[PDB]
Design a binder for this molecule. Sequence first.
Ligand SMILES: Nc1ccn([C@H]2C[C@H](O)[C@@H](COP(=O)(O)NP(=O)(O)OP(=O)(O)O)O2)c(=O)n1
Ligand SMILES: [Mg+2]
Ligand SMILES: [Mg+2]
Ligand code: NA
Ligand code: NA
Length: 326
Amino acid sequence: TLNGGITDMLTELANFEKNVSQAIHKYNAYRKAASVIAKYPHKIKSGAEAKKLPGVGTKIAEKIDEFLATGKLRKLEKIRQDDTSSSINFLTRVSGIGPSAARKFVDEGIKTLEDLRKNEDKLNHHQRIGLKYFGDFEKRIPREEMLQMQDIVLNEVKKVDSEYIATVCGSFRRGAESSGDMDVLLTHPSFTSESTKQPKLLHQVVEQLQKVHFITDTLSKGETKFMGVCQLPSKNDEKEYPHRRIDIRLIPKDQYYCGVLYFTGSDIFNKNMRAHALEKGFTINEYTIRPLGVTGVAGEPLPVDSEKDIFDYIQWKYREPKDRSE
DNA sequence: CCGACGTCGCATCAGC
DNA sequence: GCTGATGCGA
DNA sequence: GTCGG
Ligand SMILES: Nc1ccn([C@H]2C[C@H](O)[C@@H](COP(=O)(O)NP(=O)(O)OP(=O)(O)O)O2)c(=O)n1
Ligand SMILES: [Mg+2]
Ligand SMILES: [Mg+2]
Ligand code: NA
Ligand code: NA
């Protein structure tokens, strides 16, 4: 946290632009600047020093000057005092409520936690669950609890079919001492890029985890992606664990390396890596890495036998998961 | 300066 | 019901 | 908001 004050300011600006201004490219701009500054190993002394870094331009340099001199940013101080901005910024903290819905709710005079709770019939299913567990979803998950959760998921998955492989990804795989949620990558030999020899492969696992009361709620669910809620079991006379977000992603087994690269993140790392790929004449998704012809159309999937192979194509030196937390 | 600036899954809706 | 666009999130 | 061509 060498430059915590600065990165916090930039993150709050990013959130404002995303949630209120609905300007995704400014949100992206601020987050890149925040990220490059976060990994800068010097305590920043000026906006000039910061401007040297890629992603930090004139405007953010000027803000860093103001922040260093005063400890505040007038632009943010005003935003914090704005009723519409503050309301919209709050409502978007509910999972399922984005920038559009938040502004619509404010229009209708729904703008506090209390208002949401007395207007549950105006929320869609995802939003209703997000409201239910608003408190819990704000809390972080200790790695110790993540390990307990991993143990349950892997063992229950094994009970269904021993040929499943479940891999916890996200911040957990990057070695984080705490995580915002649990991300699970799932493969099974019956589901490949070439065919699906067994239906309900994701559904069966979800079902089993519901059966043992680990999964408690469902935000969304399709053939390959589950977004939901889970909870560790507690002992006698013990206060219950908080409910936690869990995502499960079924990926073609022959496409594991692209899938695990994607689901390990970070999100900024993926954006930066996929951007670099384009510059080098490739495109990367959770399934494949493909070349781009002079056309601009993706060609055929290139051979991949490790995460490192993907780095090799775009001429990046390999980076272990723990070094991908951008 | 100016056009690009990651990529996709699921839920929901408008139009037909 | 289908198609395609939009919102939201990973 | 930043910046490579
Ligand atoms: N916009 C996004 C968001 C996430 N992702 C990919 C990699 C992320 O690590 C995988 C899981 O998303 P996530 O759970 O929201 N973030 P992550 O697990 O890294 O951190 P926390 O869950 O601890 O907050 O998202 C992405 O590629 N683009
Ligand atoms: Mg996560
Ligand atoms: Mg997640
Ligand atoms: Na710069
Ligand atoms: Na939200």
